[PDB]
Design a protein around this ligand. Structure first.
Ligand SMILES: Cc1ncc(COP(=O)(O)O)c(CNC2(C(=O)O)CC2)c1O
Ligand SMILES: Cc1ncc(COP(=O)(O)O)c(CNC2(C(=O)O)CC2)c1O
Lengths: 341, 341
């Protein structure tokens, strides 16, 4: 036990708040009491989001070192790239982003998809944004390394930050701290969360939550709603991270498997489905809380699905984990026509 | 000055946090110490913003009586209409929003300005978005009353929420509370702010801050940066709201004038000048903080210009007020091309 033995650099206002989505509760049958951990209300750094939690434990190394460039990677509307740019700015360092094509840009958006959303924000923050177009892979890419070798030859000291930080040694520490927070908040709010619903694609977030909740023997409370539509590698990598992070923080527990629903990943990574959009509309319509079509949207549809199929015990307190990602909504304006009548 | 005398309804996480933009301060020649009270990180209701703070003192009057629909008005990319849509989605009411044509939509943003950004979000929250052609104006609009009659003719009980909640009778109370928070936060920071810089269009925000700071005789610390490009009315309406709010709370002092730097509104409301774009970029590149081309980008360029001309005492602590607006940044992507390295 102990994430405390690792250096942390503050990038958020502190413990992310928890929302009481009581109105969305009744709309779903008053079967459960839905709540939301707002990681999308993280800090003042370009809208916040889950990646900021992860970066807090990575920054120390960046600063202690003497790097001069923060190089990350993702797909078009990648949320991480936007927050890494925000970090480089705050650290007074250069930034090189790689926006590959991981989502089949729905024709009805082939225009704004590359000019708006999160990619616009990275440019405004002055990062060297490079629009590449390679396949989707929640793993190491054969371009991210090139950029690295590139800046090195130029005479710079580049700092690597893989997709989702999932393959960074400390990629899972941030959400371990997330668990510590929830436990403390349950006591302040006086509300015990029976389950934790969170989206998953590259790992680190879920894994950190697993290894962290395990500190209290509550790994099982976790319910990871897939969104990568590749349960294969996705569930394996998350597990590889869950075990490693566990070792770092001292938890002996061994993760062999975890609840990873996969009925809402379709039709593909980045592309929603009638259900996804319906979840966003419902959540937005009921709680005034916005969710995107890529991550938080699907994980929200799954949440509403489970509440339907009386999956949770009657009167259970479920903690929905809003990891952010709403700034990409603009690259999906076509999926949301105006209310009928 | 008893503002607590008025009923308040929770819409934010509590007192907005204050960021220490020490990097930007250094970047600008270490002339002053810049801070930023984050109204843009005040709630989980669709990104949040200044309107929400205003609304907290208006919601009580709503739910109290029997109103079916909430109706507001603003430009195509209004932030208030987007937040009202959330407040509506939350208070479990109907929402009809009038989006007037307050901005000469740049040719490069014509096929986006009305489908992306804030207008989009307001639609996801199931608001009845009505796009009207009427032009810019911070005063009571015809289309407004027309809809108030329309609905009231169809057999409903709409609640009138004018632009910026400025014309509303309780529109100023919100930021009178801001002032309160400021004085308290000065106590917890162990410092005192010499000046407060904030954008100003419809007037309710500044008027609130003015009437509020007056409770402590510090109204002169306020520096409003205009973004309307219509000095007279904005100054006159702000001055009007400030005096009414002054009575409500209990402040005797009457405002006959206030500091309104009109140097940066150019070329007009809703359109940025090269200085605005430069400011947005400088803040983003220095702090990772996002400002918009319509409101905060201009108040920020005003802040920067004032610091250059040594307007503040050396080592002065200046509190910049971030009122949000960044969500609309998606309708102005043409203005921020990828920087070069
Ligand atoms: C809102 C939101 N929800 C979930 C996730 C996924 O996190 P995990 O990879 O830790 O499962 C992201 C990530 N973002 C990436 C990006 O490019 O933005 C893939 C890294 C997210 O932004
Ligand atoms: C980011 C931002 N900054 C300043 C203002 C103006 O404040 P005042 O008019 O209350 O001084 C708005 C308002 N909004 C309106 C809208 O239609 O959104 C005009 C009401 C704002 O959104």
């Amino acid at each position: 036990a102990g994430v405390a033995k690792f250096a942390k650099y503050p990038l958020t206002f502190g413990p992310s708040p928890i929302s009481n989505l009581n109105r969305l509760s009744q709309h779903l049958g008053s079967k459960v009491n839905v709540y939301a951990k707002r990681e999308d209300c993280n800090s003042g750094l370009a809208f916040g989001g889950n990646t900021l939690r992860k970066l807090e434990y990575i920054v120390p190394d960046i600063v202690e070192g003497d790097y001069t460039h923060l190089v990350s990677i993702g797909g078009r509307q990648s949320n991480q790239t936007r927050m890494v740019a925000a970090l480089a700015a705050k650290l007074g360092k250069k930034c090189v982003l790689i926006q590959e094509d991981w989502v089949p840009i729905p024709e009805a958006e082939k225009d704004v998809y590359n000019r708006v959303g999160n990619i616009e924000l990275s440019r405004i923050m002055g990062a060297d944004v490079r629009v590449i177009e390679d396949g989707f892979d929640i793993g190491m890419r054969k371009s991210f390394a090139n950029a690295l070798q590139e800046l090195e030859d130029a005479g710079h000291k580049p700092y690597p930050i893989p997709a989702g930080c999932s393959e960074h040694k400390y990629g899972g520490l941030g959400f371990v701290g997330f668990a510590d927070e929830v436990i403390n908040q349950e006591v302040e709010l006086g509300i015990k969360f029976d389950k934790i619903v969170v989206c998953c694609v590259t790992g680190s977030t879920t894994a950190g939550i697993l290894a962290g909740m395990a500190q209290y023997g509550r790994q099982d409370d976790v319910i990871a709603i897939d969104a990568s539509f590749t349960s294969e590698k996705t569930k394996e990598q998350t597990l590889r991270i869950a075990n490693n992070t566990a070792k770092l923080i001292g938890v002996e527990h061994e993760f062999k498997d975890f609840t990873l629903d996969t009925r809402f990943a379709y039709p593909c990574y980045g592309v929603p489905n009638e259900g996804t959009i319906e979840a966003i509309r419902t959540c937005a319509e009921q709680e005034g809380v916005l969710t995107d079509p890529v991550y938080e949207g699907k994980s929200m549809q799954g949440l509403i699905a489970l509440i339907k199929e009386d999956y949770f015990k009657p009167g259970a307190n479920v903690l929905y984990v809003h990891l952010g990602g709403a700034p990409a909504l603009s690259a999906y304006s076509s999926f949301f026509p105006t209310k009928t009548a």
